[PDB]
Amino acid sequence: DPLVGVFLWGVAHSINELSQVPPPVMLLPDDFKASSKIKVNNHLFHRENLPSHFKFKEYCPQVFRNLRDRFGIDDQDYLVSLTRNPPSESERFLISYDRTLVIKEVSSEDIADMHSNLSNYHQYIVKCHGNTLLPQFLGMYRVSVDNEDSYMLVMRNMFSHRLPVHRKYDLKGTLRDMDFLNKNQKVYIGEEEKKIFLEKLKRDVEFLVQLKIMDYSLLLGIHDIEVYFMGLIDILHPEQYAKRFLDFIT
Amino acid sequence: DPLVGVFLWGVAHSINELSQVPPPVMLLPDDFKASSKIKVNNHLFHRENLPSHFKFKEYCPQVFRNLRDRFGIDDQDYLVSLTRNPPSESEFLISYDRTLVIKEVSSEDIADMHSNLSNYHQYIVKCHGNTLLPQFLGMYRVSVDNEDSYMLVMRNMFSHRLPVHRKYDLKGTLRDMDNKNQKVYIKKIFLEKLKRDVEFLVQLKIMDYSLLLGIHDIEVYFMGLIDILHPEQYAKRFLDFIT
Numbered sequence: 001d002p003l004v005g006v007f008l009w010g011v012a013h014s015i016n017e018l019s020q021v022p023p024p025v026m027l028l029p030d031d032f033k034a035s036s037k038i039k040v041n042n043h044l045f046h047r048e049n050l051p052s053h054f055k056f057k058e059y060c061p062q063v064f065r066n067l068r069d070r071f072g073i074d075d076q077d078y079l080v081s082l083t084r085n086p087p088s089e090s091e092r093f094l095i096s097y098d099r100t101l102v103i104k105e106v107s108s109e110d111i112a113d114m115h116s117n118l119s120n121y122h123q124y125i126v127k128c129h130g131n132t133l134l135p136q137f138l139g140m141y142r143v144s145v146d147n148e149d150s151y152m153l154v155m156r157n158m159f160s161h162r163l164p165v166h167r168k169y170d171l172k173g174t175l176r177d178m179d180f181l182n183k184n185q186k187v188y189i190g191e192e193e194k195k196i197f198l199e200k201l202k203r204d205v206e207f208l209v210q211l212k213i214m215d216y217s218l219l220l221g222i223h224d225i226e227v228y229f230m231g232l233i234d235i236l237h238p239e240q241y242a243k244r245f246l247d248f249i250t
Numbered sequence: 251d252p253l254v255g256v257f258l259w260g261v262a263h264s265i266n267e268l269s270q271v272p273p274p275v276m277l278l279p280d281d282f283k284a285s286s287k288i289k290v291n292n293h294l295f296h297r298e299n300l301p302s303h304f305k306f307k308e309y310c311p312q313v314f315r316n317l318r319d320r321f322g323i324d325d326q327d328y329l330v331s332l333t334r335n336p337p338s339e340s341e342f343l344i345s346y347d348r349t350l351v352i353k354e355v356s357s358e359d360i361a362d363m364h365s366n367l368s369n370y371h372q373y374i375v376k377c378h379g380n381t382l383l384p385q386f387l388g389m390y391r392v393s394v395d396n397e398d399s400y401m402l403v404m405r406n407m408f409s410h411r412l413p414v415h416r417k418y419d420l421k422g423t424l425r426d427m428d429n430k431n432q433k434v435y436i437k438k439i440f441l442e443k444l445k446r447d448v449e450f451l452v453q454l455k456i457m458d459y460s461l462l463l464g465i466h467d468i469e470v471y472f473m474g475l476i477d478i479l480h481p482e483q484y485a486k487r488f489l490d491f492i493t
């Protein structure tokens with residue numbers, strides 16, 4: 001597949017030309033308008049993998065990089081754990097070979113709103129220090145292949161790269177939260193450790209609030225031996241259905 | 251330095267891009283009509299070193315890929331010496347190693363070169379890439395600021411160590427007219443090359459072409475056919491004159 005092969009190509013090129021770039025301490029406006037696009041034209045050259053003609057572009061190269069740092073994520077690893085190897089197809093979900101990250105295909109508009117919520121996003125990243133149940137966003141690119149566009153999003157996988165999920169629902173208010181009734185879900189893992197979680201949950205959704213962020217769901221998984229994996233997923237009146245959520249997951 | 255500095259970006263990019271494409275078993279004719287261009291444009295990204303609106307064109311990657319390995323120059327070697335350190339200019343831009351030369355040439359200068367590659371390369375295979383001709387190690391065109399500029403990299407006919415004290419420009423900066431009683435003593439070998447090289451250089455009907463002379467005071471003499479860009483006529487003036 002070109003596109004996925006173009007993707008990586010781009011991930012590497014940029015991340016290595018980015019490295020050659022000193023990180024600013026303070027994100028200026030222009031950095032949120034900043035971009036990086038390459039066009040690759042080959043007549044009778046390469047073609048062993050990536051199309052003779054393609055395009056690539058990373059959005060806010062410094063903005064999402066700065067988030068990577070905020071996400072305690074080194075770029076060398078981010079690359080090696082991205083390019084060293086091919087990913088697997090899922091569902092346009094794509095688990096890294098490391099199974100540490102999640103590549104999802106997105107829409108032309110989704111990116112924009114991303115670019116819109118963007119300036120707000122990092123504000124929260126810094127303040128709460130990138131630990132929320134929210135999806136950690138590190139990668140946002142666009143892969144054109146023979147006049148074909150496709151934007152992808154790269155984030156940390158909520159599930160474990162190692163411990164396999166045997167149970168997994170999408171809590172709202174792969175069976176959805178409508179079949180979680182009769183089974184009698186377990187609202188107990190520990191008062192203390194649960195508090196911290198419940199803490200995040202409330203603030204994270206107070207944040208979604210301020211953006212007018214439409215209907216969102218929560219992904220909870222389990223790895224029985226039982227381990228759990230949980231965080232909001234579908235983050236792309238609200239106040240009315242909102243008090244349904246935190247309460248529903250309660 | 252905008253274009254020059256844009257030059258190395260592509261050079262590296264290429265050398266670092268070529269490194270992944272498996273070298274073929276036989277170079278095909280269409281290869282001689284191949285090219286690989288890169289159009290880079292970022293909005294509000296960097297400025298500190300490289301322009302925001304540059305482009306890069308590497309001409310016939312494989313062939314020069316081959317004409318390099320054939321001239322005994324590892325792409326890394328070729329790479330590091332051409333880019334690792336800012337190049338110095340001369341009367342071109344002699345690399346920082348004093349190993350490589352990067353001359354500029356007009357778009358027309360190039361047009362000939364695309365002819366020159368076909369025969370020039372097959373020749374080079376035959377003679378095992380060791381003539382008294384220039385070693386075309388690469389050909390590129392870095393267009394910076396809507397201004398195309400054609401660069402062509404070759405091996406410094408001189409040595410990065412032994413410095414010249416005297417250079418002659420023998421046809422048929424002292425030229426061939428300049429009595430100081432040259433030194434012709436040390437030969438059949440170097441004559442092996444000049445005899446066939448021109449033989450080939452004439453095959454393409456090629457007009458006037460000089461011979462470079464080098465000298466070093468510590469006998470060190472660096473010479474070879476340079477200006478490779480009627481055939482029999484002034485040909486027999488040269489070999490004979492340089493005899």
